[PDB]
PDB file of C-alpha atoms in Angstrom:
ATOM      1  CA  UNK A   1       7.801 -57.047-125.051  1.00 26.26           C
ATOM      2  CA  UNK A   2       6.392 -56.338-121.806  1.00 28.14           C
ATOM      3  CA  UNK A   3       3.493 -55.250-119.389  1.00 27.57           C
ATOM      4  CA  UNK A   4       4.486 -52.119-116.834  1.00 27.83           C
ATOM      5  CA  UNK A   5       8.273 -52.200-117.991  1.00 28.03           C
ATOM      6  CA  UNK A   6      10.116 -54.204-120.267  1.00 27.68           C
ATOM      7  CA  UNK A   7      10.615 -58.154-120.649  1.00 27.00           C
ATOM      8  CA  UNK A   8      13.596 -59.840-121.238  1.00 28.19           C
ATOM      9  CA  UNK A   9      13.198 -63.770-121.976  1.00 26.33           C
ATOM     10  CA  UNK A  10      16.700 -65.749-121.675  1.00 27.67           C
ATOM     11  CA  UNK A  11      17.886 -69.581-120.767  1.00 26.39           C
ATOM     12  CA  UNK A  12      20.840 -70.392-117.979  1.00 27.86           C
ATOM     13  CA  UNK A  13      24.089 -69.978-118.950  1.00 24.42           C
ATOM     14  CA  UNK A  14      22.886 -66.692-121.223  1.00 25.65           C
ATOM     15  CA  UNK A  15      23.875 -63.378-121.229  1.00 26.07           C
ATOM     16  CA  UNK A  16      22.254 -59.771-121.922  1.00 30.09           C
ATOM     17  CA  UNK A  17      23.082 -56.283-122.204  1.00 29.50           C
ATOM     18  CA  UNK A  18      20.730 -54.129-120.239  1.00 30.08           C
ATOM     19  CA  UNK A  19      21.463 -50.547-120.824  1.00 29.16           C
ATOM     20  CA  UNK A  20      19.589 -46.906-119.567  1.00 29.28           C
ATOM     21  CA  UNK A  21      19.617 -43.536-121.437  1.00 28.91           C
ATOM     22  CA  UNK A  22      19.038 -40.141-119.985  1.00 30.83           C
ATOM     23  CA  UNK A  23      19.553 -36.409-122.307  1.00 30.71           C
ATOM     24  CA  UNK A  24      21.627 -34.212-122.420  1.00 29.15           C
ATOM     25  CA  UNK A  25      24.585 -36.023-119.932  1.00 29.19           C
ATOM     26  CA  UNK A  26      21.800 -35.924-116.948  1.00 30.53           C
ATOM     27  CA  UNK A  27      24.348 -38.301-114.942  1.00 31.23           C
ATOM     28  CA  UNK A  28      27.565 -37.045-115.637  1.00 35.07           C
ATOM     29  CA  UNK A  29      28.160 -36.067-111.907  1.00 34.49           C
ATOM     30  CA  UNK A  30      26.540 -38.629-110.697  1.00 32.96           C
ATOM     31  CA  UNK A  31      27.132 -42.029-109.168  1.00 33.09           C
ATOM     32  CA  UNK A  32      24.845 -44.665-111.267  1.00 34.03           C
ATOM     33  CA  UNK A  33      23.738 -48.198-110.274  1.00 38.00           C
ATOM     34  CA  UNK A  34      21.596 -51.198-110.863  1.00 37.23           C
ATOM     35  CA  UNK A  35      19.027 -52.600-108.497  1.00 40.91           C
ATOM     36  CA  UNK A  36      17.086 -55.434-108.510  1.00 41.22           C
ATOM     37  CA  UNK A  37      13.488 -56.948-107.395  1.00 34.67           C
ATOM     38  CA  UNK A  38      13.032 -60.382-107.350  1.00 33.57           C
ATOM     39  CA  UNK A  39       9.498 -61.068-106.467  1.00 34.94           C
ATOM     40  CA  UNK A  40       8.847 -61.083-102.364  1.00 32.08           C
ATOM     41  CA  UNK A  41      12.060 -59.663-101.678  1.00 30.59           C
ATOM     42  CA  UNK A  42      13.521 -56.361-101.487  1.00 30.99           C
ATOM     43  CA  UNK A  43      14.827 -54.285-103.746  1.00 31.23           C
ATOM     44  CA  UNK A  44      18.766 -55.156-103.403  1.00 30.20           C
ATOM     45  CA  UNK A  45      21.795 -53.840-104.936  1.00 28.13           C
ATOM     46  CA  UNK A  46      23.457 -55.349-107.666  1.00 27.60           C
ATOM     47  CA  UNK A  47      25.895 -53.017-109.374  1.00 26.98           C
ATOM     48  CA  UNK A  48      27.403 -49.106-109.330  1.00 24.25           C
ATOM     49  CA  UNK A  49      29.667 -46.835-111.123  1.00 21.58           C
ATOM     50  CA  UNK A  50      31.486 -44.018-110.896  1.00 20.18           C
ATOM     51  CA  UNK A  51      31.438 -40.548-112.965  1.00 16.49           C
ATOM     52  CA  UNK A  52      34.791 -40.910-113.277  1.00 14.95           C
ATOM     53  CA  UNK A  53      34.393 -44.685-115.144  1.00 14.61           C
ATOM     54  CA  UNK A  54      36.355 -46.070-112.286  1.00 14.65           C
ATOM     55  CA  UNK A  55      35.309 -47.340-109.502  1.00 16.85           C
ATOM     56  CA  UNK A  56      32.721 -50.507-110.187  1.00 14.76           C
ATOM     57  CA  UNK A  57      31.296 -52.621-107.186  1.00 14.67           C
ATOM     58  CA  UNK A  58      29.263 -55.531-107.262  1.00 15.49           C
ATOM     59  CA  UNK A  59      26.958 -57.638-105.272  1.00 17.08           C
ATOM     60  CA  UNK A  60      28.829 -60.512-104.148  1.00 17.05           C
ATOM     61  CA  UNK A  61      25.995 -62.583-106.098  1.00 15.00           C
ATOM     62  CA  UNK A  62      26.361 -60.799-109.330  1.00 15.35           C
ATOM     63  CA  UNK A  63      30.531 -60.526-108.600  1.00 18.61           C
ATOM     64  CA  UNK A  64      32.633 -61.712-111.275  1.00 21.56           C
ATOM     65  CA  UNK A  65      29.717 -62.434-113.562  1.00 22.67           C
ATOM     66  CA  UNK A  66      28.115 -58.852-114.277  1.00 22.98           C
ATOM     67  CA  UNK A  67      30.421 -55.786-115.467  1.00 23.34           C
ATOM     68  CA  UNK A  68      28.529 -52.431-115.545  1.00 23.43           C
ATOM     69  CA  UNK A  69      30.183 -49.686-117.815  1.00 26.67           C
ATOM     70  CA  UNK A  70      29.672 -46.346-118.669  1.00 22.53           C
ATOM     71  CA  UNK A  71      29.997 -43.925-121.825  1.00 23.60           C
ATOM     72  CA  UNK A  72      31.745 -40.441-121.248  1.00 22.44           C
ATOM     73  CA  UNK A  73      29.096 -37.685-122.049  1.00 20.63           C
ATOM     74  CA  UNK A  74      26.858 -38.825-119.261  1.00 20.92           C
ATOM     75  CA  UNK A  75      23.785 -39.763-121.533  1.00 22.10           C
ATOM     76  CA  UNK A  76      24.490 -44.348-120.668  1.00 21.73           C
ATOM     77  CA  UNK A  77      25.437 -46.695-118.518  1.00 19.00           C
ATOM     78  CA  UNK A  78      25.080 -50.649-119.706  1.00 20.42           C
ATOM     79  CA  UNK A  79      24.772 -53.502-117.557  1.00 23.26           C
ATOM     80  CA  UNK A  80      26.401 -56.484-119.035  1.00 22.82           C
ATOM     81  CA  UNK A  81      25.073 -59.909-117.941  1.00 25.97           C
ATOM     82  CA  UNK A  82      27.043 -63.115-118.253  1.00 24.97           C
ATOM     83  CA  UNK A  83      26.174 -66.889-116.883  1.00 24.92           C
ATOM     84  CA  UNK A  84      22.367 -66.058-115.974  1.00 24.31           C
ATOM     85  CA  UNK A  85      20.708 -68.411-113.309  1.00 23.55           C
ATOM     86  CA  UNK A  86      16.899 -68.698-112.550  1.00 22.13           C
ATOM     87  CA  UNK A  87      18.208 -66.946-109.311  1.00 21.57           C
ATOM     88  CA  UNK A  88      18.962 -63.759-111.325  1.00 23.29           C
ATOM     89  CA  UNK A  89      15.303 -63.442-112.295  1.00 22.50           C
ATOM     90  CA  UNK A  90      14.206 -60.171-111.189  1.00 23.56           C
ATOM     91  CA  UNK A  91      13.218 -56.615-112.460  1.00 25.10           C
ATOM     92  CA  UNK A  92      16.178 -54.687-113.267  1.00 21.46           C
ATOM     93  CA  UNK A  93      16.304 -50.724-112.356  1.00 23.73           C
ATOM     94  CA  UNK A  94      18.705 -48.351-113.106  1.00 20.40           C
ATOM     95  CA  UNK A  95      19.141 -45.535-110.540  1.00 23.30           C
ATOM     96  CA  UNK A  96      21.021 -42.217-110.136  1.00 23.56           C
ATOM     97  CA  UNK A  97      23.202 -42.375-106.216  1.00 25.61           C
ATOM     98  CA  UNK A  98      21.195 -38.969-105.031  1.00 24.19           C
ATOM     99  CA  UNK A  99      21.539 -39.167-101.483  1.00 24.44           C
ATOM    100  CA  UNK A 100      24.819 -39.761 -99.551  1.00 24.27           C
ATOM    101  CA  UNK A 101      23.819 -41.431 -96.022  1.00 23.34           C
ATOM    102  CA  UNK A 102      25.698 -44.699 -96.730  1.00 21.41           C
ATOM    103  CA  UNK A 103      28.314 -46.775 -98.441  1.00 19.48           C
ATOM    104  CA  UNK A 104      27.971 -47.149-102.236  1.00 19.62           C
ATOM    105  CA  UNK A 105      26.094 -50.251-101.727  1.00 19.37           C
ATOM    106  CA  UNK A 106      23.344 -49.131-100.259  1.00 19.07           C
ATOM    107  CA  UNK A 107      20.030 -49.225-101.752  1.00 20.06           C
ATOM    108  CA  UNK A 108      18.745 -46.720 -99.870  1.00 21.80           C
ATOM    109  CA  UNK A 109      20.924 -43.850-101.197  1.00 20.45           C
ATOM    110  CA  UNK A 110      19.725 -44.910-104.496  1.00 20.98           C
ATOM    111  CA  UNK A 111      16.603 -43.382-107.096  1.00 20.29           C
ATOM    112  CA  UNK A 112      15.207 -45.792-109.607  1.00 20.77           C
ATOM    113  CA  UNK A 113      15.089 -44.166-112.929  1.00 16.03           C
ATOM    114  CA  UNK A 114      13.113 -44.370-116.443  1.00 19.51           C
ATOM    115  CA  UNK A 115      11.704 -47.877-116.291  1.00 20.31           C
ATOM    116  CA  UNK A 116      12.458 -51.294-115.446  1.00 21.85           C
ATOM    117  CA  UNK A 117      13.531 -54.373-117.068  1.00 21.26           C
ATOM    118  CA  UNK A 118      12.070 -57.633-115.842  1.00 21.38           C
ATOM    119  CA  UNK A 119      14.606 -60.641-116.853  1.00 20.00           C
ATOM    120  CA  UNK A 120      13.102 -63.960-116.585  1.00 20.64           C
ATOM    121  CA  UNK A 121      15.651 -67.217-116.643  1.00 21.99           C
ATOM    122  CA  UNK A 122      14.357 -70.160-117.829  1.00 20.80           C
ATOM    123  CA  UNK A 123      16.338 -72.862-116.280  1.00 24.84           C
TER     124      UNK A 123
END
């Protein structure tokens, strides 16, 4: 379904498998992420990956319950959610690392790309 991007309907305790697609391995050099928008705030960070595969970091919310992955031809990355909340309701954005002027974490170093994913929890 959706509206401006796509919609993603799941109860607490869920899971889902967001995933992004670019052609022709657009994002094999690059660093990749997921950020989020929960309505009001921010945009925050929530996850990021390596070209190499390798080196995953989390938000400290998102920590221990989300993995991110990667295939190797640069074309996906997938965002694997586990143990939704109602806190976790936001609109999901994948997002190429183009600039370099902070950590990995930052959100500012960070391009949304393609279209976003709004996940609503339904406690």
């Amino acid at each position: 379904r959706g509206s401006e991007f796509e919609v993603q309907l799941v109860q607490a305790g869920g899971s889902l498998r967001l995933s992004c697609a670019a052609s022709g391995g657009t994002f094999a050099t690059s660093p990749m992420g997921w950020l989020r928008q929960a309505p009001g705030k921010g945009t925050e960070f929530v996850a990021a990956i390596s070209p190499s595969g390798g080196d995953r970091i989390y938000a400290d919310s998102v920590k221990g319950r989300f993995t991110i992955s990667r295939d190797n031809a640069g074309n996906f990355i997938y965002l694997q959610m586990n143990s939704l909340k109602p806190e976790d309701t936001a609109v999901y954005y994948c997002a190429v690392r183009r600039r370099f002027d902070g950590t990995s974490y930052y959100t500012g170093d960070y391009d949304s790309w393609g279209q976003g994913t709004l996940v609503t929890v339904s406690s």
